[PDB]
Amino acid sequence: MYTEVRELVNFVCRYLFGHIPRRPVGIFGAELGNYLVSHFSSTWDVNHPKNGEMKRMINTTTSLCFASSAEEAGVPPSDVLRLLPTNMIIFANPGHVFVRLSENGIETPIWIGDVNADENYQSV
Template sequence: MYTEIRELINFLARYFHLRIPRLRIGMFCEHMANNCLFRFQPYWNINIPKQHEEQRIIRISRTFCDETFTSAANSVGLMLEELLNCLPEHIILYVNPGEVFYCSCDYSPPIPIWLGSVNEDLSYNEQKVDGHSLIPPPPLPTRVPPLLPTGMDFTALDWRVNLSLVSPRELGYEYTNPFTGFRMFRYVLPGAPNFTVETFAITRFGSFRKRPEHEKKFVDAIKILLILEMLRGEEGLQQLKVILQLQQHQHLLLKIVEFGVLVMKVFFG
């Protein structure tokens, strides 16, 4: 399912390149990919690929836009008109395990975007799967002026949006899913470090320099010791403060102790 959604999203993203800033395209693609993920998952059966396929049809036009599309646009502050100007008048997208198709209208024959194994997710990565993507980059629409000079070589551009898989908690979701190993999409900015909530938690006040391992253990030990000393009262806290004056990083840890003393005075007189 992750691979099929990635190919679906990258098909749409090709229409937006050179018309909308790349960062905004990536943010939009992340939101739409996750919208599709939540919709498709309850109806995804790799043993019967066509089952519930009507739940995986996405229609995009000026008269009707699928909620996965409009919700993603609203989430990143993109005007719907701005996106529709980059697309053909009508697009109908079909997603089943192992295949992604599109049609230009209800009665036109489906055109394959991507074909592969129903188990393609076993080797998922955010990069292109060679030999499966069948649609070349679409012609640039004429309704929207390009952001870049028209004389440049477009064939050298990377048209794909990198979508990695992360834990829902890294995106701020407290979503509990009955399926083991559930992941969500996250846009990976080319050349940027993959900085997550978990890696942020082990840094010095949010800086990009990770805290040394020995310092993390020392701080954790002090936290436990502080709790124990608080149970003994203010005298124990004062003794702990004297001990910390002899230790490294006391300028940080003394603040913790001073706060503990203040708490003791407020609650225990």
């Protein structure tokens, strides 16, 4: 769960790095991940990754979570939304984070791993 959410968050933040200063991007990412980890928890079944998949997916054009995380970071939501591609759908299931661009029929695997990877979440 934590692993997947982090990879999702960083994917989104990679549109922001270099454009928006480091500290508010960090706060934006933190708040986004907190929203996601709570919004995901109710359906996260590592024994059936696709279960709740469509309940968990977010849209860069219609999900409120991007604007709300931006406000928390003291960043005008228009600044983030200008930098994020439109009509981009992002999925996070146990072991699999990926994004689809319906405008072009392209999918990108953001992360694939063990559904129990949290066992070594930020370990050394």
